[PDB]
Design a protein around this nucleic acid. Sequence first.
DNA 1: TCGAGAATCCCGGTGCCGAGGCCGCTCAATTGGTCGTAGACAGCTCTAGCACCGCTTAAACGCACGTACGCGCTGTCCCCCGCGTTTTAACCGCCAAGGGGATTACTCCCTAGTCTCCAGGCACGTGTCAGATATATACATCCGAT
DNA 2: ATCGGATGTATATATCTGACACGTGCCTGGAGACTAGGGAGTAATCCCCTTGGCGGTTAAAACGCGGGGGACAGCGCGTACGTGCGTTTAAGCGGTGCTAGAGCTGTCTACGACCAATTGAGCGGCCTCGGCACCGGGATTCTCGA
Lengths: 217, 306, 98, 98, 298, 148, 93, 93, 82, 82, 107, 107
Amino acid sequence: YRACLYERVLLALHDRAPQLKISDDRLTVVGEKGYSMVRASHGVRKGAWYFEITVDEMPPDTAARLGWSQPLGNLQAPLGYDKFSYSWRSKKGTKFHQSIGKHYSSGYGQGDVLGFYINLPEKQTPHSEIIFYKNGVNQGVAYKDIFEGVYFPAISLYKSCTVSINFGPCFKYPPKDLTYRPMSDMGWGAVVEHTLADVLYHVETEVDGRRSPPWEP
Amino acid sequence: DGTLDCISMALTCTFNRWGTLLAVGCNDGRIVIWDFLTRGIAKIISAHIHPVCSLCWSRDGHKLVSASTDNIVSQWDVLSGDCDQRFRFPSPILKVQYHPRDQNKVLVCPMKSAPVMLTLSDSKHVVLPVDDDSDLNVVASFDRRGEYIYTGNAKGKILVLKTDSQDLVASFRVTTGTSNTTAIKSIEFARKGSCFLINTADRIIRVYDGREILTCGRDGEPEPMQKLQDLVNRTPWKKCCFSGDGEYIVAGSARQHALYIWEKSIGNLVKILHGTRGELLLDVAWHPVRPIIASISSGVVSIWAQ
Amino acid sequence: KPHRYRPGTVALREIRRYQKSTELLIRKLPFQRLVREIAQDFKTDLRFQSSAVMALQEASEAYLVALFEDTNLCAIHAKRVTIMPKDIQLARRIRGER
Amino acid sequence: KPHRYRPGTVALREIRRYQKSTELLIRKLPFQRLVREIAQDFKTDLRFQSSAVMALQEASEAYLVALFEDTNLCAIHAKRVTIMPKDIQLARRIRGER
Amino acid sequence: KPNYALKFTLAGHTKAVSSVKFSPNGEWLASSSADKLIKIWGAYDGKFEKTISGHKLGISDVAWSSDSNLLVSASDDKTLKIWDVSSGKCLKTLKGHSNYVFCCNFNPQSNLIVSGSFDESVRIWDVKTGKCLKTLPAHSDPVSAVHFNRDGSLIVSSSYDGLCRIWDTASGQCLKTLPPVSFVKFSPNGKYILAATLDNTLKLWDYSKGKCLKTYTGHKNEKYCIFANFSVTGGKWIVSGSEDNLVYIWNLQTKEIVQKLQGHTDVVISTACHPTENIIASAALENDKTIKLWKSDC
Amino acid sequence: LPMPMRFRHLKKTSKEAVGVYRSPIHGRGLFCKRNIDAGEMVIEYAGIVIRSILTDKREKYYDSKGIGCYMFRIDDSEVVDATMHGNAARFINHSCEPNCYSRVINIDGQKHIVIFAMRKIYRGEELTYDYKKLPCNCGAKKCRKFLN
Amino acid sequence: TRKESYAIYVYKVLKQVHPDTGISSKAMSIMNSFVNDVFERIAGEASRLAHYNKRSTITSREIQTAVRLLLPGELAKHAVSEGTKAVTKYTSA
Amino acid sequence: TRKESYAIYVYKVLKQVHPDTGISSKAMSIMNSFVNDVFERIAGEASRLAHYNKRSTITSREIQTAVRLLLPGELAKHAVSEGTKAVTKYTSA
Amino acid sequence: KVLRDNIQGITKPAIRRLARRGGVKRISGLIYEETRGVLKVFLENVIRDAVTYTEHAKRKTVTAMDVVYALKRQGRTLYGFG
Amino acid sequence: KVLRDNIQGITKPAIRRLARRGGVKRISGLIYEETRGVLKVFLENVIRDAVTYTEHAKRKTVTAMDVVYALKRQGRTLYGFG
Amino acid sequence: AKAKTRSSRAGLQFPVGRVHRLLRKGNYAERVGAGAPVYLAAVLEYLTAEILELAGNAARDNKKTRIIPRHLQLAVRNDEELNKLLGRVTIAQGGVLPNIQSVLLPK
Amino acid sequence: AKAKTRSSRAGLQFPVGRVHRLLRKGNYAERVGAGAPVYLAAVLEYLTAEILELAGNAARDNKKTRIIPRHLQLAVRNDEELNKLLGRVTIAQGGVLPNIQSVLLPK
DNA sequence: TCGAGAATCCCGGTGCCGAGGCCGCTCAATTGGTCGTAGACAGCTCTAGCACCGCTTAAACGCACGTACGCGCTGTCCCCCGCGTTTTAACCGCCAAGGGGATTACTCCCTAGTCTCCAGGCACGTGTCAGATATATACATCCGAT
DNA sequence: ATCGGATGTATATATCTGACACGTGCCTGGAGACTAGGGAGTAATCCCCTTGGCGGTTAAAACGCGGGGGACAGCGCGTACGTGCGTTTAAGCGGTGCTAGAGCTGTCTACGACCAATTGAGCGGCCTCGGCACCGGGATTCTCGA
């Protein structure tokens, strides 16, 4: 089974660089040399959802970056060095993608509890977008052009950056949408999905036959 | 015909695979690896405190098996001189012999016990069978390819086993002519072909072709390819060996410190080499690819070229 | 007809179950009375912990089964299955208890 | 006619004089060579005090005569005057040396 | 790695080819088929030397003499037939196999023959009198391949029952017993044994160890007797046919495919490696009926 | 040592480090021929690197051919299918107490599934790992009685 | 009255080795007593040695030496490694 | 190097018990080693019991108790009486 | 309340139970009382030494830690009592 | 200078001398080498532990006080060497 | 003022501070090596691991989750090194390991 | 103020100053009682008296003035309580006290 | 069993170096303040021990009895004791080199000691299942007839 | 050597539970930070013990060599010991009740700690000489064949 060593949907230790340190007191992430990247346990494939990053330490030589990244994302790169990652630089609010920085954004603060909203549909993915909030206040749209493939929330560290990801039920400035889902919800959704994946693979190899309902869901 | 002053206490020597180096044991228990071309010592190995009486090169030449008089056998890398492995037994070892086609394996002829074939990878051992169960003195040797094991007892009985299964593939007892047995002093083989020789207590060397023993089967009457002796002096043979090609055979008369040289096909005596009448002949070897012959007598080595 | 197991056999099974069991094999109160009797020799009217006396009896019985064990061993070297007092004495002797 | 004392008698007197004597009964140099041989096993080329090695040999021989003594005693319990290796082994066993 | 290129394509057997073998001198190529015909061809130019007939049923195997003077032909007529390669004369016709004879091989001294048949018994035959000297209930299934060791002291036998049995020659003693094995043969040094099993797998075993040393896959062989040869004239390789119309060549030591000779349209049923040159004859089945010479530079 | 250098060393020594023999576990299996240290590279499960979406089309294909599937999941996106093209690693039995363990490594961008040694493995030992109702005969005292 | 122990630590290492396997309080106190005894063993031995060295300070080298004195062969070897690890991990602090 | 011993007091108490007797320096060294042995014994036992009593002060009561623990029967009794008399004498001034 | 003769309170069945635990098959009678004596002698030390501790402990009740330190000093240390 | 086989350097006359000192009359052969082994085993510990002391002593020569503290730690203390 | 215990600094369990205070109150040396508590506690961790591991081995060998002192006795009697370590040591509720002598069996 | 040794006021022979020095240097307690070295030194003097007396007895029995370790070993193995105290102790140049077994005797 | 012979005890005499006595030469013991503090002691709890007594019963003591190991005796083998001889290397005495051991003098890194603050540990409640216990059952093994 | 019967033992089951895992609030030891001294570490020097070798001796070890002495195997018997079944008996549960004595806190004080000033008890070193060790020789006593 794919049983995950986690009480809640957290930053997966399986997908960190060897130069990436964690503190589960706040599940903060920190590094020592250059930039690195860590990701959460879950991964979005459809729908709209939302999470946050809480910053606990940002010296001048300390610039974290926060955003999303698809697989193929080299976890040693600073979360936006490739075309499959879209993040924000935590010195001034600047959208970073393909290592390109764009000032189509607001300003970032040292003690920012930043909210991250993102909607992928069920060659840009149709009607997919990313919205950035500062303490719930809309910092604005970050990326409308979103490539296919599953994405996951990710954090890049510079030298000694202290930031942490956080789910919805303990939120501070949450949106009141009835459609968006917190980190924990999509987390257990993907966990149950991979449980069924194990089920179906052991079925395939073990018993002849397979069968699934009217495709739409 | 040419000696070497740089080595002392020469006791036993052994040519490498190509006849370029010579590892000689000394009474101090040291290996002196001496080179033919540079005509100098190539290496000195602190093998044992006990003199070495059995020495064999590896096929690649990078390993040498040595046997002390302390019943201590040890493998040494020729480049480094380290004791790769070391073992000890009862019934002090009479001889060691690398397997010619598998240097991991090595046969050992002890004094009172049966010869045992060990491996270096695994410190295991296979005790080879004994026909009469009471020989207490059986010499043994691999053939040219290491496919069979020839074991000769003090009672003239000769067993040919297969090296892998130790199964009796041939057998026969040599005769003193009339009806008696003779102590098999030694079994030697040719590095080329299939002719081999037996030195026996009757002072008569018996040359055979192993194929004829294999086709003779168990408990047969195989005749020798040749019978060789000093019909004039009736001299024992401390050590004998073929030529490198296998068409010339030499015997060492330790009784009078001489060297007899016969042929294989005809068997007529090629020649005789006379050493120092005061020297006690101990060891004899032939250059594998040269008409050069190494002799060890009274701790001194002599060289005989042609 | 009445059945009786051969000698030792029942005792053999007793050995087996005792190596199987682990609890004490001495009645508590007699041991305690003995301990207090020994105590009054050195000083009278001294109190004790039940834990203390449990420790006493456990440690004793341990020493005792050890003595029985190695005396059994010695009797093996004595080639007998019956035990002899001299075995115990000399065992203590080797145990430096003399 | 040649005379020969009965068995043990000479050895008996040897026992008597050895309990009479007190000095060592082991040749110094062989013991020392053995000690150095043992030493090189743990570390090679280590030096020693003559006093140190004298202490080693004395203390050894003491332990050894003690072992011989109580093994003699055990053999008494073995009802034999000849010694058996099992006596020594089981003695060490009681000596906790197993 | 080899670079075998097609040089000569050979054909003419009216039915499915069952075996192609290079003459030990490398002068000729003998091709047997189920058409009761054998075909000698030039080994360097693809020149059809001649056709030798006389067998009454399909031919399942043919083997050269060591002096390149004789050829033993094992046919489905339950008979062997020893032929002089120079005259094409049926010097001998070996009778005694009670069923279809599938394989045949000479001793290293060319004076003796081993033969496997559907009768699941291996027969051992004289050459100069053509007389059966031994007969062994070797396997519990029809024999696929029999072969001599380097000297003629050991006979290896494979059969459909999946057993690879080494037997003593002088006594018929079943010395050793190591998936339906369709082919087997000794190593050139007599130290190893190459055996093909009908699961797309080749296995090289140590004889002194009795254990498989190397395995070779990637090809396709599950029904037919696909031959395997040691490529030695250049690099040390293992060449074999496959049911995918390919001619597979693995590295001998690394067991990795070093070449894939394509150009055959049917299952490459038989293979032969030149004794002296880097030449490989690959004969395919009836949907191809062609034999192709391949020459590389290493 | 570098994962590329270690992988080159593993691919150089694999042919002489391990063998396949008759197995008391089941049929034929992988045995150790030279004492293997803990954590070192035992063997690559080499084969055809494919994407996950093509697994089923292959599997059903083999299901149509009666040929057993030799596939190991590299990750959620790639699979080494060794059914038609593979190596000796297709003969590694399983044990509830494995002396080996599978790990995915990245060499020059491509992923390799290498069985490493959970412990110091000695010569002659049969190699087994955790595949993660089929009865099991691994012989371990902790055996789950079933892989599943 | 506060009575210190190590049941917390023994339970911790139990889980670290066997999260499944439980523990009895009797055997717990057995473990505690045992570790106390062996700690006093090593303490007395190291103090004795340092007194022989006449060194009023007690350092880790003493500990290594004295545990080597204490442990039967390979244990000590294994032991000292982790010990070294420890101090390395602590010297690298 | 200034090394300390007791052989002088050995000779003293010898003359106190046997004035007409000599000793082997070997025997003197043996006796002194014995002195050291009994001293370390009693000291360790006293420190250990004080630890059991959580005492940081080792006094004559500890001395007597530890001797009784160590010496048997009349040996212990006479030793206790002697130490008692001596400490009484010293405390008398 | 003056006690006595609890040594024979040790039952021969108890002794043979301990012996069977020690793995003994055949036993003689002469052992038991002898055994008992040893037993006594053995405990003869510890309690005294134990109360010796209690002696210095200046207390009327005797504790386990007493025999703990005794067996320690007796080189027969025991676990499970602090 | 590599040493070896000084164990048999222990003469059987020496062994029987020690035995007579121990008050032994009749002895078998099987003992001596066995004896020797034990001897070895016995010293097997102390020297190592001794040099262990010397280990911490950071010295190349081995002293008596080493074996003193060993036999002490081995519960076989000896007198007459400081 | 960030806090981090020396045990975490060694990534271990046994309390370096507590054992340091203990040895300090143990009156063995005037000054101490600061890493000596770390080292010794690591050794304790190791040996405790081995003994509890063997104990649990016997326990689940007896289908016993919670380990019994009998498991402890069996463990300490099986291993040669640990038995040698604790030869003259006794264990509460220990019992004796299974041991029957040769001649004890009837023929 | 003339300085007299405290052992004089104790009326003893062993140097109680050296005693208390070894005591403080022995790391046994934080502070040694005043009369504790006195008491223990008195015990030491008494036991030394006992052992030396036994030794002189033995030596004069052997018609010897100079007392060799053999006398002392004999006295050791002659005093049962002292032996019990020292049976675990080994004795250089001790030898073995004459002990003859019954069945050892001839007839 | 009374001698022969052999190992030993003892006696006188020889020569020696360790045991001992004495001599410079301190540092460690004494003396005397002085101070913070270990514990001595008083004075409270409370609880664990100590004894009481009853009820149940598994346990203990003794019996009879088979029986089988302990023991005692015989004859054998071999083997270890005793003595003789031959070989050797321990010893012993002397020499010599150096390499380590011990020493002293600097030098300063580390630890003791202090003070601050708090957070992991500890006493303390609290559900709760590992396993204790009992029961019927199925399997293993002894013991005696065949 | 087998089978049948007896019996004893491993198993599944059910439930009871009370240890036991778990969580708390509160406490203080542990961490963190800062200061000093001085134990420890390093280095150059001296010594001097050790390790090495060399030659002569013989007492000692090696080895052999009967050969009586006992290890040992076996063999008879018998007494002592397992055993199963009787019997009676204290052992254990348990629960009660009192308090004597541990076991805790709060003083206050004598008591080493410690340092400083002083030095003579003691220790390294140097004669020296006498019990003691060795030796040779004579007398005594055990022992093995009458």
